Amino acid sequence: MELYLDTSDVAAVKKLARIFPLAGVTTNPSIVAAGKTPLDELLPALHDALGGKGRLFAQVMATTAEGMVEDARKLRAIINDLVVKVPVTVEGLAAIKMLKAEGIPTLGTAVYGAAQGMLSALAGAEYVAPYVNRVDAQGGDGIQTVIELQQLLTLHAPQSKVLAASFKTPRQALDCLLAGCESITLPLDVAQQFITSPAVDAAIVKFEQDWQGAFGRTSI
Amino acid sequence: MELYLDTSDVAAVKKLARIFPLAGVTTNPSIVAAGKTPLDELLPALHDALGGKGRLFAQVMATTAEGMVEDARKLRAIINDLVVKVPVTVEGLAAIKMLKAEGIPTLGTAVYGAAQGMLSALAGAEYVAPYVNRVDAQGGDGIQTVIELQQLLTLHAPQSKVLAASFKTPRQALDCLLAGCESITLPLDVAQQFITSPAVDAAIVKFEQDWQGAFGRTSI
Amino acid sequence: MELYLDTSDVAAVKKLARIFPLAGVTTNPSIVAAGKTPLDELLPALHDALGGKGRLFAQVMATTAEGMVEDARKLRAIINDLVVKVPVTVEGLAAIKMLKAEGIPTLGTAVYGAAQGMLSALAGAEYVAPYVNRVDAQGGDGIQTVIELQQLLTLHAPQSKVLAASFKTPRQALDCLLAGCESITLPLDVAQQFITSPAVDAAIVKFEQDWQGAFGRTSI
Amino acid sequence: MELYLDTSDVAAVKKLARIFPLAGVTTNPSIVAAGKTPLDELLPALHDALGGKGRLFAQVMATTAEGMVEDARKLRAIINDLVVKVPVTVEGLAAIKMLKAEGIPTLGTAVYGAAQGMLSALAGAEYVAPYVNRVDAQGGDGIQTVIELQQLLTLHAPQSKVLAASFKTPRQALDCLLAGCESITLPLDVAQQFITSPAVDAAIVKFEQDWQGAFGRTSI
Amino acid sequence: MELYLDTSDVAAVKKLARIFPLAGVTTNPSIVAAGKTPLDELLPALHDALGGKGRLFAQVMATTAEGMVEDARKLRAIINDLVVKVPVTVEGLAAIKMLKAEGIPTLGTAVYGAAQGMLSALAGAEYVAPYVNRVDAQGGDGIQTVIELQQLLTLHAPQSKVLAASFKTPRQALDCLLAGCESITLPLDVAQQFITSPAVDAAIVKFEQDWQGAFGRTSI
Amino acid sequence: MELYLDTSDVAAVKKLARIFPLAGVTTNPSIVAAGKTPLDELLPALHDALGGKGRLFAQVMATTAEGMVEDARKLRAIINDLVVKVPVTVEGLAAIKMLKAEGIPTLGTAVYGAAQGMLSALAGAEYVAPYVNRVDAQGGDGIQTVIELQQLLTLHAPQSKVLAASFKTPRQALDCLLAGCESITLPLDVAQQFITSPAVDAAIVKFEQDWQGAFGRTSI
Amino acid sequence: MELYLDTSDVAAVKKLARIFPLAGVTTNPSIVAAGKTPLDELLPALHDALGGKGRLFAQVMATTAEGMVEDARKLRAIINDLVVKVPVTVEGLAAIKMLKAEGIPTLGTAVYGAAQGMLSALAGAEYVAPYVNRVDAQGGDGIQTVIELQQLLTLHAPQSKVLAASFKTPRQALDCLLAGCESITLPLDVAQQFITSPAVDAAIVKFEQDWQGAFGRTSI
Amino acid sequence: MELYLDTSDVAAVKKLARIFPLAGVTTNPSIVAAGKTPLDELLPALHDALGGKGRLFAQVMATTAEGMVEDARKLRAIINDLVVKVPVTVEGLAAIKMLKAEGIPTLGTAVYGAAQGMLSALAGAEYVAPYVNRVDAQGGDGIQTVIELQQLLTLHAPQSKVLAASFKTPRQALDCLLAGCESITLPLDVAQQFITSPAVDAAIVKFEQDWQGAFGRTSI
Ligand SMILES: *C(CO)[C@@H](O)[C@H](O)[C@H](O)COP(=O)(O)O
Ligand SMILES: *[C@H](CO)[C@@H](O)[C@H](O)[C@H](O)COP(=O)(O)O
Ligand SMILES: *[C@H](CO)[C@@H](O)[C@H](O)[C@H](O)COP(=O)(O)O
Ligand SMILES: *[C@H](CO)[C@@H](O)[C@H](O)[C@H](O)COP(=O)(O)O
Ligand SMILES: *[C@H](CO)[C@@H](O)[C@H](O)[C@H](O)COP(=O)(O)O
Ligand SMILES: *[C@H](CO)[C@@H](O)[C@H](O)[C@H](O)COP(=O)(O)O
Ligand SMILES: *[C@H](CO)[C@@H](O)[C@H](O)[C@H](O)COP(=O)(O)O
Ligand SMILES: *[C@H](CO)[C@@H](O)[C@H](O)[C@H](O)COP(=O)(O)O
C-alpha cells in the first residue's frame, strides 16, 4: 500500500506525517490554487514536512503533448521524487507515451472511466487516478469504475497501480481499498475521520474507569 | 494487451499511432473494400503509418481449404509481421490445420459461437475473433459469447488469445476487456470515444480557472 | 482438449479427420451394432480413417469381472493401444481394479451419477464418460451431473478426465466444455452443427459482395 | 398450460391423444412435407385424431404481407379452431397487423430472438414461438432466449403467450416450462421420453414383487 | 399443510394420531405388503386408528388404463373417499384422464422427474408424489426435482399439490416443506426424529433443575 | 410487531415500560426461578408494572400431555391476557392439540429446529419460540433456523407468529427482525443496548456545543 | 481420497473389498456392538477381509483423558495400521493432545459442529469425523456443518482431513465429497446404492439387445 | 491458527491449558481490573498457568504516543513473549510507528472499523483486534467488519494477522474463523460452549448403552 495525503496544507502534512505511514503527498491544480503557494515553494515545503522524504505528485497545465512534456521537465526540476500527473486526453496520452520513452514517471489523472484509465497504463503511466467522488457526484458509480479499472490493470497492465482519488466520505476510500487499489490519496477530513471515533473513545474511557476502580489510578 | 485499430484509413492510423499504444491494425474484406486500396499497397502503407512496426491481419477470400492456403501464402509474401485471418467454416478449419503444419500464423475469424471459436484454436489458430456486435445485432448476447469463448480458451487452449472485434459502443469493448480478452481491435469511432469526454474536459477547464484565480496565469 | 467422434461410420471419420483436430474415435455396443461391422474389422478401419493414428475406445460385453478382463484382452489384441470401456457397475468396478493392476487403460462408462463416476476413477479408470443426454432425457440434469463429476475428479482424482458423451444438441456439448471436461465425444450431427451457421455463411457472402463491389472479383 | 404435439403423424396423434391432455397439434412447412399429406387432407385428419376437438396451427407460405393474408384466409377456411403461423419478418409483421385488424388469430413463428418475438406480440400475435433447439444448435442459448422472451411478454404484452417449440431433449422443454411458457409443442420422441423411464419401470416391478411376496398375486 | 404418515402400522398410527395433526395415511404396494394385511382389512383399520376421519391413499396394481380404472373402483368401494394413487406411466396417464372424467380423485405417484409430475396434474391428478429419496439414492437431486415440480405446479397447474414422499432423513422432508410442498407423507422413523431432540430434552432438564433449586419442586 | 421483555425483574419492567412500546413480558421456568417469586405473585406484579395491560407468557412444568393441560388451566386462572408456553416434545405436541380444542392460546417453546416449530403451529400454537442463542451456542446456526421457521409459517401456517427468543447480542435480535419475525422477546441487557450508543451520545454533545457556540445557551 | 466402509460385517467387507478401492474400515462402539464380535477378534478379521492391508479405526470408551490414553494404547496393540477415535469432549481434547505428544494418530469423532471439529484438529487429530446424518436428524444442516468444518481445516489446520460419516442417503455422501472432504466412511447400504442403478442396468440391457440384433450373440 | 483465552483468571487458564491447544492469553484494562492483580504479578502467573510458555498480550494505558512507548517498554520488561496492545487512535497510530522503529511487537486494538484496523497494520502492528461484539452491540455488523478487515490485510498488509476478539456467542467466533482470521481470543464462557454439547453427550451415552448391551461392561 502507498498512502498519500491530497493537500497543499504544509502544517497539516507535518502534523499528520508522524501519525500515518505516508508515502507522500499528491496535488492537483485546484489543491495548489487553494493553498495560494506556488509549486516551487510548495513542493520543497511538503518534502520537508514529510521529514525530508516521500514521493510527490504535481500536474501539468499545458494542453499540447509537447507543452505537457515541457511542464513535466519543469516539475521534475523542482524536487527529486516527483511523479508527473497528466490528464488522460488525446494530447495527454500522447504526452504519456513521450514521457515513457524519456523515462519520466507519470500518473494518468482525471480518469472518469475504466478503459480511459487502462489506456493511460498501457501508454506507460505507473499510476492511474480515478476521480471517484466526481464520478459519484455526476450520476455514475465511482466504486464500480474503480472495480472495473483495477480488474483491467490486473488483467492487462499489472505493472501499473490504481491511485484512488477524490473522496467525500471514508466509505468511498474503504470501498476502493476493498477493490484492491495499491495506492490511495486522502483529503485531510477523510484521513482524520478514519482514526477518530466516538465508539473507540468511549471504549478507552471505560477501560480507564475500570482500571481506576481496581487500582486507584488510570496509568500503568 | 494487444490494442489494434480495425481500419483501412492510413492517415487516421498515422494520427492515432502517436496517441494510442497500438499493436497494429486488423483488416477484413469489407474494410479493405471501403478503402478501395488493394492489400499489396494497403498493408505496406499501414506498416509505415504505424511507424514501420506492428502486426497486421488480413483475410483469405477463397472458399476451399487449398485456395485459402494459397491466399495465406500470398498475404505472407506482402509483409513480414502478418497473421492470416481464416473464417471458421468447414473448409476454413481444414485450412487452419494445414497452415499450422506449414507454420503460417492464423486467426480464426467470423466467430459467432464459443465452440466454433474454440475449435479454430484447437486446429492451430493463435487468435480467435468473435464478432461481438454482429451477435448483439442478430438477437444474441455478444458479451456472453465472448465470456464463454474466453473460458473455453483458458480451460482448453490457453496459448490462443481472443481478439475481440465488431463494436458499435465503448461499453461492448470494455465488457470484452473485463472478460479477459488479451487482444482487441477497435473501429476508429469507438477508439476515439474512449479518449473524449465532456466530464474530463470540464475537469480540466475548472483546474485552469482555479489556477488562474490564484496565480493570474494559466501556466506552470 | 481431446476431441473424439462417437461413430462407426468409417467414411465419415475419414472426411471429418481433415476438418477437426481429432484425438480419435469412441464406440459403444449400439454404435458398433448400427454399423453392422464387427470390431476386428471396424477398429482397424477407424484407425486407418484417422490417418493411421489416434486413440480408439471400445466396450466390453461380458457381465462378470473375469469375463470383462477377458474381453479387455481381446479388444487390446485388436488395437494394442485401445482404451477399454467398462460399465460402472458392481462387476465393472471390480474389472476396473483388475485392469489397473494388469496395466490395461480403462474408461468407466454408462455413468448416470457423479459419485458412480468418481468411484470408477478411484478404481483406476483414466476417463469417466457420463451419458449427458440420457440423464437429460430421463428427467434429470445432465449438465449438473457433469459439473459435479468434474468437481469430484478435480478434488479427489485429478489424474482422471471426464470424457463427456451422449449429445442431442451443441448446447449440451458446449456446457460440458465450459464445465471443464478435458475430453468429449461428439455424434456426427452435433459435431457438424458446431461448424455450420447461417450467420457465418451470410458474413462471408457480404464480404464477397463488398470485395467484388470495390475490385470486381473475390480473389486475393 | 396448453400442450401440443408437433407432428403430421395422424396415427401417432390418435395414440397419444389418449395418454396426454393435448390442447391440439402444431405443424410447420417441413413437418407437413415430411407427412406427405396436403393441409386440406391433413388438418381434418388431425382434428379427428384428437377426438374431434383441439386447436390446430398451420403456417403461411407467401413472402408478401398481402399473400400471407390470402394464405391465412385459405387456412381458416379448412378448419374452424385454427391459428395461423406467420414468420416474424418485415412482411410477416405487416401481415400480423393486418390479420389482427381482420380478427384472424396468429402465432409469430421462426423467432430466434426475444425482441423479434415481442414485436410479433405487440403487432397482434396471440402466441410467439421461439425455435429453442435451432438457437441452441447455431451457437446461441435457446433457453436464455425463452427466459428473455417470456420476461418481455410478461412485462409488455401479457395477453400473448410463449409457445415454445423445437426440441431435441426433454431438458430443453422442461427448462422452457420452468421459464413460465404457458404453451409448448413437443415432437413425438421428446413427448414420449417424458413418460418412459427405467427408474419408474423399476419401481413398479419392485412394487409387483413385494405385493406377490405378501399376497400370492400381482393384482388388487 | 396436509401431514400424512407413510405406513401400514395401524397401532403406530393410533399412537401418533394424538401427537401429530394428521391429515391421514398414505400406502403403496410395498408398505401394504410389509404389513401382510390386505387392503379390504387395512384401510378400514387405518381409518379407525385416525379417529374415524382423515384421507387415505392406496395404489392400483393393474398395468393397463382400463385395469387401473377397475382397480380404482375397487379401492373406492373399500374407502368411499379414498384418493387413488396411479403411477405416472403411459397407461397411468391414460387412467388419470379416465378417472378425472369419472370423478374419482387421483394422485400421480412414482414421479422421478418434474415434467412427468406436471403431466399427471394436467391429466387431472389432485396430488403429485415425487419419490425424493429414490431420486437421491440413484445419483440425482431429489430436492431439486421437488423445487422444479413445485414451480411447474405453481406456474401451470396450481389446483394440484405436491405430496412429497420417500424420506430417509428429516433434512429431506424439511427441504421439501421449504420448497413450498402443500402436503407430505413421512415414514414413522423420520416423523419421530422431528420431535425427538437431545438439545430439547436438556433444555427441559435445566428448566426443571432451576425451578426445583428455587421452589423445591417442578410443579405449577 | 409485538415487543416483549424476557424477565421476572418487575422494577426493571416498570422502568422500561415508559421507554419501550412493550406488548408485555415472557417468562420461562429459569427466569421465574431467578426472580424467586411464584407465578401467582409474579404475573400480577408484571401486569401492574406494564401499567395494567399487556400480554404475559408462562410455561407448563408437567411431563405428560394431561398434566400440561392442568398446568395451562392453572396459569390461565392467574391472569386474563395469558398465553401458555408448551415445550414442543411428543407430550407437548399432544397437549398443544388438546389446548387448541379447549380454546386456551399456546406458544410452542424450546424450539431448536424449524420443522419442530412448524409442527407446533400446525397443532394449534399461535406463537412459536425458537431458542436462537441456544442453537448458536451449540454449534448450529440460530438465524438460519429462524429464517427457515419463518418461511415454514409463511408458507404452511400463516396465522402463527415467530416469537424469537434467547439473545446474547443485538445483532441476533436484529437478524430475527430482518427475517420477518412478527414478535420478539428481549433480555434486559440486549434491550438496553439497542437504545444506548456512544455515537448517538456524541452526536447530541456536538449539537449542544454548536448551539451554545451560536446562541450562548444550551436550550431552545 | 480415502474410501472407508463403516461396518463390523467381516463377510461384507471381504465381498466389497473386491469391488471398491477401499482405504480400510471404520468402527464405532455401536457398530462393534451390533456385530457381536469383540475388537481383539474383530480388528484382525477386518484386516484379513481387506486382503491383509488398509487402515482401521476404533473408538476409546473411557470418560477421562488418562483412561482414553490407556484405551488408545490397548487398541494400537491389537493392530498395526490403527487410528484411535476420540470423542471431541473436554476430556477427549485433553486425550488428543496427550496422544499427539505420544505419537499415536487420532481421529476426533462425534463432531456435531465445525468449531468443535477444528479444535480437535488443532489439538493433533489427523482426521475429524462429523456425524452428518445425526446433525440432519436433529433439525440442523449436516452438509452446512461439513462445508464449514472443511473451510476451517483448509484455512487453519490443512494437515488434518475431514472423514465424513453418518449417512442415510447417497446424496448426503455426495454433498460431503463435493464439499471437499478428503476421506469418507460409508454404511453398506449407501455404498451399494452408489453402484446399483435402474438407469445403468437398462442401458446395459439395451446395449446387449442391439449387439445381439447385429451379431447374433451377446458376447464380444 | 493461534488460539488465545481472553482472561485474567489464572486458575481457569491452568485448567483449560490441558484441554485446548492455547497459543497464550490476551488481557485488556477491564479484564486486568476484574482480576484485581497488577500486570507485574499477573503476567508471570499466566506464563506459569500455560506451562511456562505461550504468548501474552497487554495494553498500554497512556494517552500520548510518548507515554504509550514508555508503557510498552515497561510491559516488555515483565515477560519475554509479550505483544503490546495499542488503541488505534491518533496517538496510538503514532505510538505504533515508534514501536515499529524500536522493534517492539504491537497489536492495534479497539478496532471498530476495517480501514482503522488496516492503518494500524501499515503502521507496523503484527496483529489487529476488531471488537466484534461491540460493533454488533452498537447497531453495526461485527462479522462484516471482520470480513472487510481480513480482506484489507490479505490485499494490503499480508504480514499482519486479525486477532478477532469480543464475543458473546460461539456463532460470532465461528464466523470470524470462517472469514479467515489467523488468530482469535475467546472469553471463558464461549470457549467452553464450543466443547459442551447435549447432542455429543447423548451420542456418548448411546454408545455406552450399546456396548454394555453386547459385552456386559462399559470398558474396552
Ligand atoms: C485484546 C485484543 O486481543 C482483548 O483482550 C480484547 O480487548 C477483548 O476481547 C475485548 O472484548 P470486550 O470489549 O467485549 O470485553
Ligand atoms: C491527484 C491524483 O493522483 C489528486 O490530487 C486528485 O486529482 C484529486 O483528489 C482530484 O480531486 P477532485 O477531482 O475532487 O478535484
Ligand atoms: C478482424 C478480426 O480481428 C476484424 O477486421 C474483424 O473482422 C471486424 O471487426 C469485423 O467487423 P464486422 O464483422 O462488423 O464488419
Ligand atoms: C463412449 C464413451 O466414451 C461413447 O461411445 C458413449 O458410450 C455413447 O456416446 C453413449 O451415448 P448414447 O448412449 O446416447 O449413444
Ligand atoms: C410451430 C411453432 O413454431 C411448430 O411446428 C414449430 O415451427 C417447429 O417446432 C419448428 O421446428 P424446427 O425449428 O426444429 O425446424
Ligand atoms: C405414496 C405417495 O403419496 C407413498 O406411499 C409413496 O409411494 C412412498 O413413500 C414411496 O417412497 P418409498 O418407495 O421410499 O417407500
Ligand atoms: C419464552 C419464549 O417466548 C422465553 O421466556 C424464552 O424461553 C427464553 O428466551 C429462553 O431463554 P434461554 O432458553 O436462553 O434460557
Ligand atoms: C467413525 C467415524 O466417526 C464411524 O464409525 C462413525 O462414528 C459412524 O458413522 C457414526 O454413526 P452414527 O453417527 O450414525 O451413529
Automatic annotation (TrEMBL), chains A, B, C, D, E, F, G, H:
Organism: Enterobacter cloacae
Function per UniProt: Catalyzes the reversible formation of fructose 6-phosphate from dihydroxyacetone and D-glyceraldehyde 3-phosphate via an aldolization reaction.
EC number(s) recorded for this UniProt protein: 4.1.2.-
Name of the gene encoding the protein in the UniProt record: fsa
Protein's recorded name: Fructose-6-phosphate aldolase
NCBIfam families associated with the record: fsa_talC_mipB (TIGR00875), PRK12653.1 (NF009296)
Gene Ontology CC terms: cytoplasm
GO MF annotations, alphabetized: fructose 6-phosphate aldolase activity
Database matches in HAMAP family: F6P_aldolase (MF_00496)
Alphabetical list of PANTHER family matching this protein: FRUCTOSE-6-PHOSPHATE ALDOLASE 1-RELATED, TRANSALDOLASE
Active-site residues, Swiss-Prot/TrEMBL: 85
Keyword Secreted: no
Localization per Swiss-Prot or TrEMBL: Cytoplasm
UniProt key word Transmembrane: no
Family membership noted in the UniProt record: Belongs to the transaldolase family. Type 3A subfamily.
Quaternary assembly: Homodecamer.
InterPro entries: Aldolase_TIM, F6P_aldolase, TAL/FSA, Transaldolase_3B/F6P_aldolase, Transaldolase_AS, TSA/FSA_arc/bac
UniProt GO BP: fructose metabolic process; ketone catabolic process
Record keywords, A-Z: Carbohydrate metabolism, Cytoplasm, Lyase, Schiff base
Swiss-Prot/TrEMBL catalytic activity: beta-D-fructose 6-phosphate = dihydroxyacetone + D-glyceraldehyde 3-phosphate
Chief subcellular location: cytoplasm
